[PDB]
Ligand SMILES: CCCCCCCCCCCCC/C=C/[C@@H](O)[C@H](CO)NC(=O)CCCCCCCCCCCCCCC
Ligand SMILES: CS(=O)(=O)Nc1ccc(C(=O)NCc2ccc(Cl)cc2Cl)cc1
Ligand SMILES: CS(=O)(=O)Nc1ccc(C(=O)NCc2ccc(Cl)cc2Cl)cc1
Ligand SMILES: CCCCCCCCCCCCCCCC
Ligand SMILES: CCCCCCCCCCCC
Ligand SMILES: CCCCC
Ligand SMILES: [K+]
Ligand SMILES: [K+]
Ligand SMILES: [K+]
């Protein structure tokens with residue numbers, strides 16, 4: 414009976430699919446409820462700014478203003494500061510930023526503030542990713558090991574002193590609490606504070622950055638080291654180390670959250686069974 | 695001896711670290727060599743466009759222009775981007791961790807929800823993508839059961855045909871999940887042949903720079919186009935998930951072969967030098 418389990422597998426996958434379909438629909442409406450208003454409030458107030466310089470300079474062709482703005486937004490994607498009060502310009506592909514870029518490729522964070530424009534840069538980025546992503550995986554896995562065996566020494570000491578008048582499978586709950594607590598301190602809270610001061614971000618923007626980065630979603634709306642401001646350069650190599658170990662942390666956390674879903678799915682799969690079997694007495 | 699194994703583990707991690715460090719250094723110089731010139735060529739030709747626009751339109755003064763550009767930079771920070779469909783797109787970019795970033799939350803509440811929506815959505819999507827990987831894998835197992843029957847009754851036998859099977863996987867795999875979609879993006883999006891394959895890899899490896907996004911431009915899209923792209927991603931991600939893992943195991947083998955090749959080079963230099 415090889416096809417027997419396969420019929421049972423397709424049933425499980427199809428239900429998860431429809432859950433994901435419905436989870437996206439929920440998220441979709443939640444986001445547009447949150448972001449549609451600010452969008453329209455800013456599109457109406459950008460047309461207010463539009464006609465303030467549409468008719469304050471009629472001697473501009475007025476179809477070429479909207480083509481001008483295309484030419485600025487097209488060139489802003491490579492990163493430009495097209496100003497006369499600042500015509501000397503730092504490079505986005507210097508010795509360090511191309512090193513940053515390679516990191517965003519193999520980690521699959523891919524902020525996208527810096528992206529290749531040359532046809533050769535694209536072809537190499539394709540080759541660099543298909544080899545670098547697996548290569549980086551072994552590093553991140555070994556970092557997960559070393560970081561995990563450090564925590565194993567930490568709970569060996571703590572699961573010794575909390576042995577008062579003790580069960581085996583319930584202290585596992587205490588160990589997962591100290592993991593998430595210490596974890597969010599070293600890899601979420603403490604770094605976000607540093608980004609708040611050094612980058613100038615808000616308290617929310619920093620934690621937003623930490624999560625979007627270490628989950629490798631990497632929108633790129635916020636990037637550490639993205640400005641010119643000062644950058645001690647004590648700063649940036651520490652952020653590399655943060656990513657290396659912070660990615661290893663969310664790797665476990667996200668896997669823990671996955672197992673929680675497994676349990677919640679089991680509890681709710683049987684709750685529907687109990688709901689049926691009772692059906693109002 | 696518990697710390698004896700741990701020293702063997704840290705030495706394994708440290709060497710891989712130094713490989714990744716040096717792999718980044720190689721890549722860094724290679725991209726800088728590739729992209730530093732385009733940067734200068736476009737920085738010089740954007741200043742040409744700037745001082746061209748003051749002369750070809752004396753109407754505008756040098757002082758008005760700096761004001762306009764701040765107002766465009768202000769609007770780049772926002773741009774419908776959040777209509778019924780694009781917010782659905784957005785949630786997809788979150789759970790898949792592709793995160794193109796062409797659309798990103800600006801409201802403080804949208805950020806807080808995106809944090810919560812990801813921490814629960816990313817594991818949830820993993821199970822879907824894992825199940826898609828299973829079903830897709832058992833389909834191809836039916837395919838090799840057929841093909842490992844017709845080739846294996848004749849010319850050269852086992853332990854080398856497993857190499858032939860993985861070639862068929864990668865060959866037809868790149869057909870269904872890289873080549874055939876990239877052709878569709880070339881026509882429908884208007885991209886180049888390179889840009890489409892560039893998109894396919896950046897997207898399905900979940901790097902997702904966001905420089906190229908299918909459905910991101912303002913073009914008429916057939917009602918079947920975007921939902922097929924979802925299905926593509928769902929199954930295309932499952933494809934590179936295996937492909938990247940195959941490439942990982944290749945490196946494992948290559949690491950073993952090169953780790954002993956160094957041992958051979960040393961062992962010859964050893965008793966070639968004992969020859970006095
Ligand atoms: C596209 C960017 C090019 C990146 C090229 C990086 C290759 C670096 C040179 C390979 C040797 C690394 C240093 C020596 C390590 C050995 O002492 C050690 C065993 O003792 N090997 C390993 O740890 C295991 C290491 C084995 C990993 C091999 C990586 C495969 C890269 C394939 C790229 C082919 C292009 C060839 C261009 C030269
Ligand atoms: C806007 S810029 O690109 O032109 N300037 C720079 C931008 C960023 C960095 C940098 O190292 N940030 C830390 C870091 C490291 C690795 C990874 Cl993967 C992600 C991150 Cl955030 C350096 C220069
Ligand atoms: C300015 S815009 O908001 O309108 N740009 C858009 C870009 C793409 C889409 C869309 O549906 N793409 C298919 C798709 C599905 C899931 C995933 Cl994860 C990725 C992708 Cl590309 C919608 C809008
Ligand atoms: C942040 C949004 C959370 C959305 C949670 C959706 C919960 C969906 C529950 C579906 C229950 C299906 C029961 C099937 C059991 C056979
Ligand atoms: C058309 C340009 C393609 C460039 C990709 C070739 C890269 C060669 C590898 C360099 C090894 C150091
Ligand atoms: C049939 C393969 C799906 C992508 C077009
Ligand atoms: K990204
Ligand atoms: K990713
Ligand atoms: K991005």
Ligand SMILES: [K+]
Nearest residue numbers: 522630792901
């Ligand atoms: K990403």
